[PDB]
Design a protein around this ligand. Structure first.
Ligand SMILES: CCCCCCCCCCCCCCCCCC(=O)OC[C@H](COP(=O)([O-])OCC(O)COP(=O)([O-])OC[C@@H](COC(=O)CCCCCCCCCCCCCCCCC)OC(=O)CCCCCCCCCCCCCCCCC)OC(=O)CCCCCCCCCCCCCCCCC
Ligand SMILES: CCCCCCCCCCCCCCCCCC(=O)OC[C@H](COP(=O)([O-])OCC(O)COP(=O)([O-])OC[C@@H](COC(=O)CCCCCCCCCCCCCCCCC)OC(=O)CCCCCCCCCCCCCCCCC)OC(=O)CCCCCCCCCCCCCCCCC
Ligand SMILES: CCCCCCCCCCCCCCCCCC(=O)OC[C@H](COP(=O)([O-])OCC[N+](C)(C)C)OC(=O)CCCCCCCCCCCCCCCCC
Ligand SMILES: CCCCCCCCCCCCCCCCCC(=O)OC[C@H](COP(=O)(O)OCCN)OC(=O)CCCCCCCCCCCCCCCCC
Ligand SMILES: CCCCCCCCCCCCCCCCCC(=O)OC[C@H](COP(=O)(O)OCCN)OC(=O)CCCCCCCCCCCCCCCCC
Ligand SMILES: CCCCCCCCCCCCCCCCCC(=O)OC[C@H](COP(=O)(O)OCCN)OC(=O)CCCCCCCCCCCCCCCCC
Ligand SMILES: CCCCCCCCCCCCO[C@@H]1O[C@H](CO)[C@@H](O[C@H]2O[C@H](CO)[C@@H](O)[C@H](O)[C@H]2O)[C@H](O)[C@H]1O
Ligand SMILES: CCCCCCCCCCCCO[C@@H]1O[C@H](CO)[C@@H](O[C@H]2O[C@H](CO)[C@@H](O)[C@H](O)[C@H]2O)[C@H](O)[C@H]1O
Ligand SMILES: CCCCCCCCCCCCO[C@@H]1O[C@H](CO)[C@@H](O[C@H]2O[C@H](CO)[C@@H](O)[C@H](O)[C@H]2O)[C@H](O)[C@H]1O
Ligand SMILES: CCCCCCCCCCCCO[C@@H]1O[C@H](CO)[C@@H](O[C@H]2O[C@H](CO)[C@@H](O)[C@H](O)[C@H]2O)[C@H](O)[C@H]1O
Ligand SMILES: CCCCCCCCCCCCO[C@@H]1O[C@H](CO)[C@@H](O[C@H]2O[C@H](CO)[C@@H](O)[C@H](O)[C@H]2O)[C@H](O)[C@H]1O
Ligand SMILES: CCCCCCCCCCCCO[C@@H]1O[C@H](CO)[C@@H](O[C@H]2O[C@H](CO)[C@@H](O)[C@H](O)[C@H]2O)[C@H](O)[C@H]1O
Lengths: 172, 318, 98, 114, 69, 115, 83, 345
């Protein structure tokens, strides 16, 4: 359990490596779904709750649209996977090896700097208000309705203007 | 002991699913002036087990054009997610007590569409691709209003915790103050479960079998098991949200018995609806949701923000 | 915290490297932008939680809101590209060299 | 670059109020009325001084006040109080509203006796 | 006749009561005869951890009354 | 730990059924059996060719409307505020502009599928 | 205003969903402004004590602050008890 | 576009930079830059041909990538210092990627390659917005953190922009591409002086804008997209020949025109800081701009290119343009050097 968050952030890194190699967007879309789920777990692991569940829900919706767009406008006869092309496969394996190497070397030079494999799990949660009640992340987000209304004004305007923008872009 | 509790949730739910296949076939039969299964076991009560054993003894398809990883993953993901939706359900005490259990349901249910999308794509056949693209349209149709409908209801609950809904309804069904949202919620759960009149991703009269057309044998059974498990889940959810079963701290089993009765009834209306109506056209489902439900859902969300303020009826945080 | 933030920054760098090193599909690049957004969301969220900065939790949500607008415009543009050429390949988008 | 001064383990010895949360919650309303002066002194020290080492003397008076409060319950109202906190302890949230019958019996006792 | 649908319904009905009932009973068996404690907020978790620490047996649900002081 | 435990069991059960389904039955693989289905005749092309999306504009509108509900889901916490009038105005304005956006797209025929 | 009445009547028969949506939207705005209970919603949120009420040091010039929680000074909650 | 769309989109184009210039929080500054990108795309692609689609797409992917790098810097600084503004203690690498990403947003060389292509693919009135209004928000951010910026990266970006703006404009026959290279060269001057005197950055921005706006209006009058098209001015609108010639010489920084002032003052300030070598290189290669402007002056007002028979029908028609904003900007962009002390301090 002391390796739990490092494992998750390590899985997240692999997901972005897979996305960066850009196979067919079908598998790119899947890569973001898995990374989104892993990202939700990391937010949860640091004491989050609302933020982790939001980003997964938003990305579940986002990649469903991308799936629909992919089958219409970004498809070929032979969609590529990570294994299809030896060159992409090699850089996937080499990228994972270079991750193990980069973490291994940085552990050696500093030991407590960016990588501190000896102290994993000791520096996740720093302070916690033990007897508190109103502490969950949803309370913080809800300040858009009371104390940070400007944040919600700009967010609302961008979604509203986005409707007019996409209608203009898409008309013939 | 926690492992025993997992068994006493999963196994009864899987038996309930199996016998819903029997109940559906008999209820549909009798509404059609037929009997339905009455030979394989007494009154057909072994028919589900025969169908299960037949399917898992059948050769499973390995089609040549298929992308095999997603082909196998999709039905596996389908049953996993269907079973996972049950763990936070309070009947009246859940196996897993979640602070944001409603948001857990939406996220898990929203990941469930990808089993349809990937199976249809991975099969690499035209009728399966048609079924996958109807799932894309289906989710766009109903997911736009399902969370806002839930939002308005939970402004009387005061939280996303499922167990709090029991206390919210201690003196009254949430149906009474929220029946217009309950109606729209009920139609949404039909679409969410790909049930008639919105059984479009399979729609056998049009796409032969849609997303699962290339699937045989045991892999096919997983999609079927996942669909029938979800029907029970969504109606049990409707029961806890709007039809608050009677709760007494010293008689928990009274809640469970009342919950089952209402959940059984809501599952029966799903089968009753299937026997009664024709199918929507999948563009018409989108217009139903976006041009009828969505305007009213937005107005009612505004009304349910307005209500607790002007009646001083804000529910407690805790 | 130390090792998690290192890995998240590396995840952003890989997504940016994906953005900067085109293959053929424009859509594959649009997915890399969503990867950078996702990395930055987690980094902001984890920082706010680790510092107990509840007044900053609106900010990660605003990151996703504008990313959705950016992604919607990107897809809208991709429809236009596909209509012209019948694919989303970026090698066709070369008329403005002259 | 200075040494952080910590009280000895001997300085931190106190008589513990080692009763469960349902016992504390059942008595919490009368406890707040009966031990207010000592409790408010300690909390003013903590918020003014911002240092738990500067408030150890007042922290020990909080424990002694709580033990004198519970010994008055023990000598006069033990059985009404036990029936109350045991009923309160059944609920997963330890809710007051499930034991109003037993709360009234306890409240009546501490009113007549004390 | 329609009432021949009921054998399947009764089997369904029994199977849908077991999860609720079994979870309630297993909670009481594994929580000292009481409902399993719900820690929605950090304050509730703190009380459970204090209950575990004063229990003498490292179980939050073993309660200590005035006999302990 | 418990949530991890049950979901792993759910994964474990699903994967076991898949393994049984693939290793228990008798097999008989030959080319005509495994060719893609299309009502008894051969397909004339790949299923991997472009499939036109007539509701593409509704689809990308759904992306924006899905971030609008994300802005609405903190409302249960927001109704606890002392600043009730501010919260109420912000929520009312947010819902109204989203309605106006939907109304505009509706009158522009943006919800009509392309032909 | 007989032309609108025919308009509204037709909209009711033919587009009842939209008529209800606009009516509900208008009612939601109007009701907080005319309700006698609107003022209490903020007051109830204000009376919920999520934080410890830190005492104040008594300087001898605080006639209004109670010295004990059962002093008759300070904010009363009788309005909520009888709401 | 119908009026409602125009109002909303133009309002958002205006709003973004106003948010960026007024924001204390770096996240709200980034939000302002996000509004600019989103709102300008539909205007870029409004005419809907393959070239405008190419221009809007290239603009989107560059700008969105730069926006992510800017956001990374903001988030890294929030991690380091628990605040939403760059400080003296902000890590220098964080500041260097901000500079890199903002310079890519501005089209400074060597992040310039997109800008001549996008300008070529869009209508002239959109090129005008792209090269004037859209510069203000990224520059406004840079001006706020001018003491924190690395002089080495700035001067290298600045000299690179002046060099490539010069050589770039030398090969062009397309007017929209000449203006894009003129933009890049002038941005090189704006940036060079920013870490020393940000007021002189603003002086150069203002003079560049009031030179570029009437130059675009002059192109818009007959829709002159090429040298050969603008060379017909003597027959179509000869009254403009005087002001186009002086605006071109002012853009090139020839005294005694107003456009000499920004180059003169920036050199003075660079040499007050011992930046003699860069100032010499900058001033010497800025002469190459005057060469291609002169060749442009040769083909419009100092010689008369061959005309065509259909142009006689144009002489029968009355025009309603330019508006009187052209004359005001044209005069103030050329004849205001006598008022130089009132423009620098
Ligand atoms: C489930 C277990 C796999 C069972 C698959 C199977 O049925 O056997 C096929 C296979 C037997 O050989 P085969 O049937 O002749 O292969 C033909 C398949 O169609 C060829 O298989 P395919 O068309 O499905 O393509 C395989 C491809 C596609 O598979 C996947 O990538 C999907 C699963 C990834 C998770 O997988 C890869 O390219 C290698 C994946 C490496 C892991 C991904 C790491 C980077 C992404 C990071 C994000 C994580 C997501 O094993
Ligand atoms: C360590 C790296 C860890 C992994 C990290 C990966 C990061 C994400 C990868 C994103 C790459 C990408 O999407 O680009 C697609 C880009 C375009 O792909 P495409 O449009 O599908 O077709 C061209 C490909 O060559 C495919 O078409 P092709 O098959 O005709 O390519 C022919 C040629 C291609 O030659 C290469 O192998 C290129 C890679 C050279 C080795 C670089 C070593 C890493 C440094 O292959 C060979 O015969 C040489 C094989 C022996 C190479 C050793 O592909 C590439 O050029 C190579 C991609 C993999 C390189 C990743 C290394 C990134 C490091 C930065 C390099 C640039 C530095 C320049 C300033 C110094
Ligand atoms: C992977 C194993 C999954 C086990 C799931 C339960 C199914 C059990 C019955 C099938 C056993 C298949 C098997 O392993 O046979 C040995 C395998 C042969 O597998 P097989 O090809 O004969 O599998 C088919 C099984 N029958 C004959 C019943 C249809 O032989 C080996 O030793 C290869 C290793
Ligand atoms: C195959 C893929 C299957 C995926 C199944 C998808 C299920 C839906 C997505 C689940 C993510 C949301 C989980 C969640 O929110 O649970 C949080 C839970 C703590 O719950 P909380 O209410 O905050 O209470 C703590 C304070 N008392 O946190 C916990 O109790 C434990 C930590 C939560 C992480 C569990 C994640 C689910 C298990 C994934 C297994 C790997 C799947 C691959
Ligand atoms: C599957 C298993 C099958 C279901 C098992 C349960 C069946 C129970 C059957 C007994 C129900 C008795 C209800 C009374 C019916 C007789 C009666 O008195 O009529 C009541 C009313 C009509 O009354 P009447 O006066 O005759 O008509 C004119 C009135 N204006 O008519 C009514 O409104 C009564 C409505 C009764 C509804 C309950 C029966 C339907 C149960 C199946 C639900 C759907 C299943 C899917
Ligand atoms: C505000 O943005 O001014 C920027 C800049 C002055 O720089 P700065 O001091 O840093 O800005 C802070 C307060 N102004 O302001 C400037 O750079 C000045 C821009 C001047 C543009 C010159 C264009 C020619 C116009 C000449 C007519 C103006 C009036 C001339 C003098 C009239 C007096 C007779
Ligand atoms: C995609 C998956 C990637 C998997 C990545 C690798 C996962 C495994 C992580 C290995 C990193 C170090 O993991 C483990 O860290 C803990 C701190 O929590 C160390 O902790 C332990 O050992 C070290 C000394 O050896 C001391 O801190 C101490 O004695 C003890 O706490 C373990 O010795 C080390 O093995
Ligand atoms: C050109 C387009 C822009 C015009 C459209 C936008 C109009 C402005 C609407 C948003 C108004 C925000 O209004 C602003 O709200 C905040 C709280 O959120 C108030 O903030 C106040 O309360 C907060 C609560 O934490 C205190 O910390 C703060 O010190 C105090 O000023 C500001 O005093 C008020 O100015
Ligand atoms: C280190 C290497 C070790 C040595 C490896 C040797 C591998 C040789 C594998 C032989 C094939 C076994 O794999 C299995 O073969 C059987 C029959 O042979 C075939 O299985 C199926 O198809 C054929 C089709 O006519 C039928 O005859 C057969 O009865 C049926 O079961 C499949 O091809 C495969 O399911
Ligand atoms: C273009 C978009 C248009 C859609 C947006 C329209 C928003 C306008 C909202 C108008 C309604 C505001 O309604 C307003 O509600 C607040 C509380 O919320 C009431 O406020 C009342 O109760 C509050 C408590 O909440 C007291 O503190 C306050 O003193 C009292 O006035 C106002 O009396 C009422 O006027
Ligand atoms: C550009 C800046 C200055 C203008 C400022 C912006 C305000 C403009 C006010 C006038 C706008 C009215 O513009 C009007 O918009 C509506 C949108 O409902 C369009 O109308 C739309 O709905 C109506 C419904 O009956 C139908 O015409 C049709 O379904 C659709 O076009 C009109 O065709 C257009 O004429
Ligand atoms: C510091 C000193 C400042 C020097 C100021 C510079 C003055 C302007 C120099 C550029 C001259 C403008 O260019 C000059 O424009 C006039 C019209 O105005 C043209 O004028 C001539 O041709 C046009 C048609 O082309 C006829 O309509 C016009 O009647 C005829 O005189 C000249 O043929 C052209 O050469």
């Amino acid at each position: 359990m002391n390796n739990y968050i490092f494992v998750l952030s390590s899985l997240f890194l692999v997901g972005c490596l897979g996305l960066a190699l850009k196979p067919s967007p079908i598998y790119g879309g899947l890569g973001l779904i898995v990374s989104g789920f892993v990202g939700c777990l990391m937010v949860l692991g640091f004491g989050g709750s609302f933020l982790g569940l939001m980003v997964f829900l938003i990305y579940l919706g986002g990649m469903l649209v991308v799936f629909g767009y992919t089958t219409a406008m970004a498809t070929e006869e032979y969609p590529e996977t990570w294994g299809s092309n030896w060159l992409i496969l090699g850089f996937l394996v080499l990228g994972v090896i270079m991750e193990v190497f980069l973490i291994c070397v940085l552990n050696y030079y500093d030991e407590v700097g960016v990588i501190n494999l000896d102290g994993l799990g000791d520096w996740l949660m720093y302070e916690v208000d033990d007897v508190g009640v109103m502490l969950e992340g949803g309370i913080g987000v809800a300040a858009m309705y009371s104390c940070a209304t400007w944040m919600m004004v700009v967010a609302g305007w961008s979604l509203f203007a986005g409707i007019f923008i996409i209608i203009e872009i898409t008309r013939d | 002991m926690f492992f025993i509790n997992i068994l006493t949730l999963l196994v009864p739910i899987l038996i309930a699913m199996a016998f819903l296949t029997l109940v559906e076939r008999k209820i549909l039969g009798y509404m059609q002036l037929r009997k339905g299964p009455n030979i394989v076991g007494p009154y057909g009560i072994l028919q589900p087990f025969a169908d299960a054993m037949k399917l898992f003894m059948k050769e499973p398809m390995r089609p040549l054009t298929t992308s095999m990883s997603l082909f196998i993953i999709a039905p596996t993901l389908s049953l996993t997610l269907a079973l996972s939706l049950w763990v936070p359900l309070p009947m009246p005490h859940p196996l897993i007590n979640l602070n944001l259990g409603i948001l857990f349901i939406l996220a898990t249910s929203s990941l469930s569409v990808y089993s349809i999308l990937w199976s249809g794509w991975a099969s690499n056949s035209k009728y399966s691709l048609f079924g996958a693209l109807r799932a894309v349209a289906q989710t766009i149709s109903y997911e736009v209003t399902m969370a806002i409908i839930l939002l308005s209801v939970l402004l009387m609950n005061g939280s996303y915790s499922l167990q709090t809904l029991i206390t919210t309804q201690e003196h009254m069904w949430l149906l009474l103050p929220a029946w217009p949202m309950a109606m729209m919620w009920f139609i949404s759960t039909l679409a969410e479960t790909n049930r008639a009149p919105f059984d479009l991703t399979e729609g056998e009269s049009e796409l032969v079998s849609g997303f699962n057309v290339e699937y045989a044998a045991g892999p096919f059974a997983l999609f079927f098991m996942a669909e029938y498990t979800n029907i029970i889940l969504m109606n049990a959810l409707t029961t806890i949200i709007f039809l608050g079963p009677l709760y007494y701290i010293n008689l928990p089993e009274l809640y469970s018995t009342n919950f089952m009765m209402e959940a059984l009834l809501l599952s029966s209306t799903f089968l009753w609806i299937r026997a009664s109506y024709p199918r929507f056209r999948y563009d018409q489902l989108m217009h139903l949701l976006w041009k009828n439900f969505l305007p009213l859902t937005l107005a009612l969300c505004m009304w349910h923000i307005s209500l607790p303020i002007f009646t001083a009826g804000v529910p407690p945080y805790m | 915290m130390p090792s998690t933030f290192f890995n998240l920054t590396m995840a952003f760098s890989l997504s940016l490297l994906g953005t900067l090193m085109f293959r053929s599909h424009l859509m594959s690049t649009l997915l890399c932008l969503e990867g950078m957004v996702l990395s930055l969301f987690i980094m902001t969220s984890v920082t706010s939680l680790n510092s107990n900065s509840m007044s900053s939790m609106p900010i990660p949500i605003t990151i996703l809101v504008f990313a959705a607008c950016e992604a919607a415009v990107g897809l809208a543009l991709l429809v236009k590209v596909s209509n012209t050429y019948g694919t989303d390949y970026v090698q066709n988008l070369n008329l403005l060299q002259c | 670059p200075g040494i952080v001064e910590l009280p000895t383990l001997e300085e931190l010895k106190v008589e513990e109020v080692k009763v469960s949360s349902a016992v504390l919650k059942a008595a919490a309303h009368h406890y707040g009325a009966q031990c207010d002066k000592t409790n408010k002194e300690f909390m003013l020290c903590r918020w003014e001084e911002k240092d738990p080492r500067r408030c150890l003397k007042e922290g020990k008076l909080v424990n002694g006040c709580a033990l004198n409060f519970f010994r008055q319950i023990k000598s006069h109202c033990a059985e009404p109080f036990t029936e109350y906190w045991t009923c309160l302890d059944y609920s997963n949230m330890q809710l007051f509203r499930h034991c109003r019958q037993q709360q009234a019996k306890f409240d009546q006792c501490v009113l007549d006796k004390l | 006749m329609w009432f021949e649908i009921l054998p399947g319904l009764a089997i369904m009905g029994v199977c849908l009561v077991i999860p609720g009932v079994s979870t309630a009973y297993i909670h009481k068996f594994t929580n000292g005869g009481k409902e399993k404690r719900v820690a929605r907020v950090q304050y509730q978790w703190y009380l459970m951890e204090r209950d575990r620490r004063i229990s003498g047996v490292n179980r939050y649900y073993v309660s200590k009354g005035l006999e302990n002081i | 730990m418990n949530l991890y435990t049950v979901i792993f069991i759910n994964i474990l059960l699903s994967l076991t059924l898949i393994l049984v389904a693939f290793w228990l039955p008798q097999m008989n693989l030959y080319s005509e059996k495994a060719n893609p289905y299309e009502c008894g005749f051969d397909p004339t092309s790949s299923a991997r060719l472009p499939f036109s999306m007539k509701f593409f504009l509704v689809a990308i509108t759904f992306l924006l409307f899905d971030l609008e509900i994300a802005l609405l889901l903190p409302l249960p916490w927001a109704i606890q505020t002392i600043k009730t009038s501010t919260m109420m105005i912000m929520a009312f304005i947010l819902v109204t502009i989203l309605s106006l956006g939907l109304a505009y797209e509706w009158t522009q025929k943006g919800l009509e599928w392309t032909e | 205003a007989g032309r609108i009445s025919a308009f509204l009547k037709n909209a009711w028969a033919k587009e009842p969903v939209l008529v209800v949506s606009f009516s509900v939207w208008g009612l939601a705005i109007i009701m907080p402004m005319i309700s006698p209970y609107t003022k209490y919603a903020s007051m109830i949120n204000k009376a919920t004590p999520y934080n410890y009420p830190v005492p104040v040091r008594d300087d001898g010039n605080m006639p209004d602050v109670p010295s004990h929680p059962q002093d008759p000074l300070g904010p009363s909650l009788d309005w909520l008890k009888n709401l | 576009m119908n009026p409602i769309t125009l109002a909303i989109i133009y309002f958002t184009i205006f709003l973004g930079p106003v948010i960026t210039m007024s924001s204390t929080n770096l996240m709200l500054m980034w939000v302002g830059l996000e509004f600019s990108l989103l709102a300008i795309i539909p205007m870029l692609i409004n005419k809907k041909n393959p070239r405008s689609t190419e221009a809007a797409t290239k603009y989107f992917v560059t700008q969105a990538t730069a926006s992510m790098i800017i956001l990374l810097a903001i988030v890294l600084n929030y991690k380091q210092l628990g605040t939403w503004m760059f400080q003296q203690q902000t890590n220098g690498l964080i500041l260097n990627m901000t500079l890199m990403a903002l310079s890519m947003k501005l089209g400074l060389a060597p992040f310039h390659f997109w800008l001549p292509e996008v300008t070529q693919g869009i209508p002239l009135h959109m090129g005008l917005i792209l090269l004037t209004w859209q510069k203000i928000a990224p520059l406004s951010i840079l001006i706020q953190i001018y003491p924190l910026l690395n002089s080495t990266i700035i001067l290298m970006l600045a000299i690179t922009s002046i060099f490539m703006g010069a050589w770039g404009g030398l090969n062009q026959t397309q007017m929209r591409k000449i203006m894009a290279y003129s933009s890049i060269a002038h941005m090189g001057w704006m940036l060079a002086i920013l870490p020393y005197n940000p007021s002189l950055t603003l002086l150069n921005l203002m003079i560049y804008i009031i030179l570029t706006a009437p130059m675009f209006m002059a192109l818009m009058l007959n829709n002159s997209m090429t040298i050969n098209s603008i060379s017909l001015l003597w027959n179509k609108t000869p009254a403009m020949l005087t002001m186009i010639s002086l605006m071109l010489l002012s853009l090139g920084g020839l005294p005694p025109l107003t456009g000499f002032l920004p180059k003169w003052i920036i050199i003075t300030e660079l040499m007050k800081n011992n930046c003699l070598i860069m100032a010499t290189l900058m001033a010497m290669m800025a002469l190459l701009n005057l060469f291609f402007y002169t060749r442009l002056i040769y083909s419009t007002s100092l010689t008369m290119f061959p005309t065509n028979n259909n142009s006689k029908m144009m002489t029968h028609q009355t025009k309603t343009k330019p508006n009187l904003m052209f004359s005001t900007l044209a005069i103030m962009s050329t004849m205001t050097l006598p008022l130089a002390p009132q423009l620098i301090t």
